[PDB]
Amino acid sequence: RTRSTISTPNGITWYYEQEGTGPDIVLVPDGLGECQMFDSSVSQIAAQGFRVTTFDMPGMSRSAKAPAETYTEVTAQKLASYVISILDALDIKHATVWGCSSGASTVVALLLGYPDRIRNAMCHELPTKLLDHLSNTAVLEDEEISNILANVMLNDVSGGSEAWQALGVEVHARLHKNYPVWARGYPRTIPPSAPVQDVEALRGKPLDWTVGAATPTESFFDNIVTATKAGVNIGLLPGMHFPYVSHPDVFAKYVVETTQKHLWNS
Amino acid sequence: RTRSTISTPNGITWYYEQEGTGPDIVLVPDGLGECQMFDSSVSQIAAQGFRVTTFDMPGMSRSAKAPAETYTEVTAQKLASYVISILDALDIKHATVWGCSSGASTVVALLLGYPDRIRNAMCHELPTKLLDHLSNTAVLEDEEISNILANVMLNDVSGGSEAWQALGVEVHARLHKNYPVWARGYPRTIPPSAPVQDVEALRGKPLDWTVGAATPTESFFDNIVTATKAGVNIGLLPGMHFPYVSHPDVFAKYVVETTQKHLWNS
Ligand SMILES: C[C@H](O)CCCC(=O)CCC/C=C/c1cc(O)cc(O)c1C(=O)O
Ligand SMILES: C[C@H](O)CCCC(=O)CCC/C=C/c1cc(O)cc(O)c1C(=O)O
Ligand SMILES: [K+]
Ligand SMILES: [K+]
């Protein structure tokens, strides 16, 4: 496993990790921007003959050295532009990409905006609606935000509380700092930026969409409807919002099998 | 409200209830066949200018006096034929119908099989897949089945434990007796009878489909995909499998608004 940093001319100094040799697979974090959530799965995926790259997101975790514009008023299109910049810097010319949540919005924006660069995209639980209870956290003090959101993650959406806790002290210390950055920068601007206003733009694209099997139906009901309208492959992963944390082996297998499916079609 | 019994030529003695004056709305129970679950909603719906009819299902609750054929090897098409028989007996020529679970399968079979008789159908959480853990209960002793399924209803699918328990001792005593009848007669034969093989047969039909907002996505994921493929209205009700129990006011409002929509479209 390579663990290193790289600076892109948009002002971001990224923390990134890479393992393996073969076709490129890129794992984009969810909104919390913390790539140690992929630790187990990176090794499992790489062992099947892929070069796997992941990174902390701008302003989050070890990628905190970044201009304010990269972690405020954040949109899918902004994040896609940042991910392309690190792929450029790492000389990754063609990639399979995974993303959940804001990361899902990001990888759909990548596929649509950079079709020559993206082999296929896997998106999971893509937020398309403003949720006032999340948006309203942006006006609380930092410690309040961290307390509230740490609880929501553990108890409401982790899909596996033991696995979530087992991320460890250092990871949760980084997440503690990320929660206010995410709250102030993401929930009011990510959902309106969802690249799903044109179902016909999605039709025929190499997109595989998932929702968590245990997620309440309401939460990403809209994803299932939109994917089906567009004729996009739509299915389920175990758990809820963090399948790479709750079920890392199943997650790794899904990423490998999906990449292999598109390498055959390619 | 009328509370009475009526016998049909097929050998069933039905317990039925009826309240109100106006266009007919018929509430078909779920597999447990117990129409007291509609008690609150019947009055709320009737008060908006509808004649509302409901009944216990054959072999269940107060409609137990019925031939074994009617509660063994049960299919959507069998249940639809039985519901038509009581509508005939009650001189209900045109009806709006609601059904959940096996009742959902029933109302779609009614709409497709008897289009002259059905104004519109509301289906909720329609089972299309065999579930071994439910099917396998059919070989257990009666009291084992009742204990197991009572627990599943309360803890896994009620969508409101307080409301579920508040059905009261009389209702739960009837359900306790129904669980083995349901287990032996329904889960092995109801899902393969689902009238959803042909999406094109559903297209353009006056069908409104719902799933519970809190239901785990995996439970009726297939409903959302099928409805969307067929261009059928698909949406959510609060709770899980029994919105008429957990949220009777919202349930009543949905039934009234949906019936009104189709009366206009008529
Ligand atoms: C991990 C995740 O990305 C950030 C933590 C929040 C969470 O898990 C709540 C459940 C999923 C909703 C996300 C979401 C919802 C919104 O209404 C707006 C958003 O921008 C996100 C967003 O940016 O992802
Ligand atoms: C209320 C319900 O009608 C009967 C009680 C069981 C329950 O609530 C499990 C959750 C929903 C699955 C139903 C279901 C599932 C199957 O695999 C087969 C069925 O025939 C039903 C069936 O007959 O409905
Ligand atoms: K696993
Ligand atoms: K209610």
Residue numbers in the entry:
A (entry chain A), B (entry chain B): 2 to 267
Sentences from the paper on this structure:
ZEN is a resorcylic acid lactone that is produced by several Fusarium species as an oestrogenic mycotoxin. Zearalenone hydrolase (ZHD) is an α/β-hydrolase that has been shown to be able to detoxify ZEN. Structures of apo ZHD and some enzyme–substrate complexes have recently been reported. These structures reveal a catalytic triad consisting of Ser102–His242–Glu126 inside a ZEN-binding tunnel that is enclosed by the α/β-hydrolase fold and a helical cap domain.
Here, we report the 1.60 Å resolution structure of a complex of ZHD with the hydrolytic product of zearalenone, which reveals the final stage of zearalenone hydrolysis. In order to obtain the enzyme–product complex structure, apo ZHD crystals were soaked in 2 mM ZEN for between 1 and 45 min before quenching in liquid nitrogen. The expected hydrolytic product ZGR did not appear until the crystals had been soaked for over 30 min. The crystals of our C-terminally His6-tagged ZHD protein diffracted to approximately 1.60 Å resolution, which is much better than the resolutions reported from structures crystallized using an N-terminally His6-tagged ZHD construct. The conjugated coplanar structure of ZGR was comprised of an entire phenol ring, an adjacent carbon double bond C1′=C2′ and a carboxyl group O12′=C12′—O13′. Structural superposition of the ZHD/S102A–ZEN structure and our ZHD–ZGR structure revealed that Ser102 Oγ of the catalytic triad points towards the lactone C atom C12′ of the carboxyl group at a distance of 2.52 Å. This suggests that a nucleophilic attack on C12′ initiates the hydrolysis reaction. Taken together, we suggest that these interactions are altered as a result of the breakage of the lactone bond. It is very likely that Trp183 N∊1 is responsible for the unidirectional translational movement of the phenol ring, which in turn determines the conformational change of the lactone loop following cleavage of the lactone bond. In the case of ZHD, this enzyme–product structure provides the final state of catalysis.
